[PDB]
Design a protein around this ligand. Structure first.
Ligand SMILES: [Fe+2]
Ligand SMILES: [Fe+2]
Lengths: 210, 209
């Protein structure tokens, strides 16, 4: 009985149903093959591995597994699969072919924190570029202060392990962009905005700041 | 102290490859895979390190790595120097068509691991299981003269724990994604075919002296 970022995301794990047709990629940014690799190979493997480890978590959220395994050395393998499952699921919810325009509520909140949407985007791209190795770049709500914050994590790291509430993420594991952008992570992050589902981000913002 | 690459020095320079960098590393790495890895990834580490290393002129890259390891203020330089060393060492480990394993190294591997095939499977598994970006290494422990498989994350480098590498496989996704996409396991299985075991054996002989 507490807030979850994705309360519908539960164990036994399942690859999530995408808001759109997989075979089309996520135009204009991600090709069909880039999405197929990422979703049908990478994400699918985390779902499959997690299902060999999570006995006892039936009916519970994936976030509950993350929170029960975080910082525990003997549980690193399960933590990594559960967090990656959650991280990818959340990522797909953040995206849509051609994007969705940012509602006024969200625009105001982003400008109130960062000065403008443009200044937030510049800062967000920079944090993603600078995230050494594999990981994720996040926009989160701090529920105590109501601040919006950019946070980067390494590998399977997830800001909800520190009590932050994600509202947007960009995967910056090299596999997220290597098929279409090769080494060009900066270009990937700049182009990614064209496919962000800002309606989902705004929905997350409203519930996270309540 | 012992250096793995005593000729790899600052100011940093992309190393000359023992082969033509436009022809890839057949039969495993395509020309474009090698061009990206060397001319983009490795090249950016070199360039960035050269913005940071003033004062280290004439020193080994490994001395920079030792001077910056575990120091929070120097994380960025550590990452560049370590990655420059790791990639330069990787390229020496590889050759088109490979080079056959000399008996001395064959015997040492089989003594440590049970057999060469046992070593290879164990090494492949460690690379597959190295979560995220990193490197999987065959090293000599100079305190025992034993061989061991060691995995590192990100720019992590065995020398910071007093180990002497003799072989490494890059398992950053960029090392294999062009030719193998998500198939890291296949990459590691196929990588044996371009391994320069003459260099690996030279390193073994040197590390255990
Ligand atoms: Fe991913
Ligand atoms: Fe690399």
């Amino acid at each position: 009985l507490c807030y979850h970022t994705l309360p519908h995301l539960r164990y036994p794990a399942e690859l999530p149903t995408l808001g759109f047709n997989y075979k089309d990629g996520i135009q204009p940014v991600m090709s069909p093959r880039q999405l197929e690799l990422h979703y049908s190979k990478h994400h699918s493997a985390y779902v499959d591995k997690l299902n060999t480890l999570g006995k006892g978590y039936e009916g519970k959220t994936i976030e509950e597994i993350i929170l029960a395994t975080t910082g525990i050395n003997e549980s690193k393998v399960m933590f990594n699969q559960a967090a990656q499952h959650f991280n990818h699921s959340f990522f797909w919810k953040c995206l849509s072919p051609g994007g969705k325009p940012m509602p006024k509520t969200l625009e105001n909140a982003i400008a109130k924190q960062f000065g403008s949407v443009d200044d937030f985007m510049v800062s967000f791209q920079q944090a993603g570029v600078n995230n050494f190795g594999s990981g994720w770049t996040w926009l989160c709500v701090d529920p105590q202060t109501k601040e919006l914050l950019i946070d980067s994590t390494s590998n399977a790291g997830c800001p909800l392990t520190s009590g932050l509430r994600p509202i947007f993420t960009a995967d910056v594991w090299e596999h997220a962009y290597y098929k279409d952008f090769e080494n060009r992570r900066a270009d990937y992050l700049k182009e990614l905005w064209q496919i962000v589902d800002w309606e989902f981000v705004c929905h997350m913002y409203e519930r996270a700041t309540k």
